[PDB]
Design a protein around this ligand. Structure first.
Ligand SMILES: [K+]
Lengths: 330, 34
């Protein structure tokens, strides 16, 4: 429950690198939401079973080897399980594995998934694929308090499926200072007049040539939404995305001042098939017979489908955010 | 007097806790609640 400071820094670097890399490799353009935190956790469960070049490629994309191997499962526990109380805020991270009754997990793999409190079900994909899809979708719906529905679409799983790894994340926080909806709509650059919300709030904000940022606190001031608004989105995209970690750090470090903050009311939902994007990021062997998951189970397994869905809802009262990541092996 | 913040141009957001790990990330260019 208390990691070395350098190791925390190493994982901050890896998780921001994955976030920016996912953004930079994405095909969906002007409006997008995702949880690379969810992706990391789901793929962490695959990586625990990886060996050889599959292990190395997962390490390259997700940053899993940024910390000692003997602390890997403990780091996962540190991000899945509650460390400090969340108070009024809800943060719920759950994992589930549905494995063919024909799959024999290694002793090491079974121990890790039990240590991580990962739900494990042994199921019959050969005849029950549709029912299993519904069960997984119900699991995600419950974990996300109904925000992520019908996560796995028909066809994602089949009679040839051998395992499905699912991570879900649910976040619910009220703004420390509730916003008031502004009576008049506000012109948003490149868009239209939109409903905005405003209040005099106590917040950290940075005003620089490249961007304006604000950290909008949730009740308790332990979680926040950090908004980074470039002065020129395209230039920022081309040159500054790599220092997202430091722009967040600088924003949180700045003094809080009592100031007016105006932001749009907004909801965003994004779905995608991850496979092609992951290959472009360098995860190649996992998707065919070169896959080496010899630490997971005996046999010859590979990833058929990797799926992500995320939703963020921002209103005058607070934020609800949910995401799921599914990995189906053949 | 403290400078106001008006989010009136395309923006990124991240949801973070004390470890500052990005729990969620997005970009908004056309804000809608539908
Ligand atoms: K008003």
């Amino acid at each position: 429950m208390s990691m070395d400071y350098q190791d925390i820094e190493n994982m901050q670097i890896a998780l921001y690198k994955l976030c920016v890399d996912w953004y930079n490799s994405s095909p969906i353009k002007e409006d997008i939401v995702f949880s690379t935190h969810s992706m990391f956790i789901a793929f962490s469960l695959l990586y625990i079973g990886a060996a050889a070049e599959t292990k190395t490629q997962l390490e390259k994309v997700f940053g899993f080897a940024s910390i000692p191997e003997r602390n890997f499962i403990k780091f996962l526990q540190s991000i899945i399980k509650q460390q400090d109380p969340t108070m009024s805020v809800t943060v719920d991270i759950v994992n589930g594995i549905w494995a063919s009754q024909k799959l024999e997990f290694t002793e090491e793999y079974k121990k890790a998934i039990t240590t991580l409190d990962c739900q494990l079900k042994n199921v019959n994909f050969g005849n029950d694929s549709e029912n299993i899809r519904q069960e997984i979708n119900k699991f995600v719906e419950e974990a996300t308090r109904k925000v992520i529905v019908d996560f796995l679409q028909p066809g994602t799983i089949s009679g040839d499926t051998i395992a499905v790894i699912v991570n879900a994340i649910y976040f619910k926080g009220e703004w420390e200072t509730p916003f008031k909806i502004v009576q008049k709509k506000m012109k948003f650059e490149g868009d239209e007049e939109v409903v905005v919300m405003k209040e005099r709030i106590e917040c950290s904000a940075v005003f620089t040539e490249k961007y304006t940022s604000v950290s909008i606190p949730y009740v308790g001031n332990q979680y926040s939404m950090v908004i980074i608004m470039p002065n020129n989105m395209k230039e920022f995209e081309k040159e500054n995305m790599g220092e997202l970690k430091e722009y967040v750090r600088r924003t949180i470090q700045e003094f809080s001042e009592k100031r007016n903050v105006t932001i749009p009311k907004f909801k965003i939902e994004t779905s995608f098939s991850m496979n092609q994007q992951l290959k472009q990021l360098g995860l190649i062997n996992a998707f065919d017979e070169r896959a080496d998951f010899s630490k997971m189970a005996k046999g010859h397994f590979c990833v058929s489908e990797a799926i992500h869905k995320a939703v963020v809802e921002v209103d005058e009262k607070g934020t609800i955010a949910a995401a799921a990541t599914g990995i189906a092996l053949m | 007097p403290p400078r106001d913040v008006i989010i009136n141009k395309p923006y990124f957001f991240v949801i973070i806790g004390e470890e500052q790990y990005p729990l969620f990330f997005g970009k908004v260019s056309h804000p809608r609640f539908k």
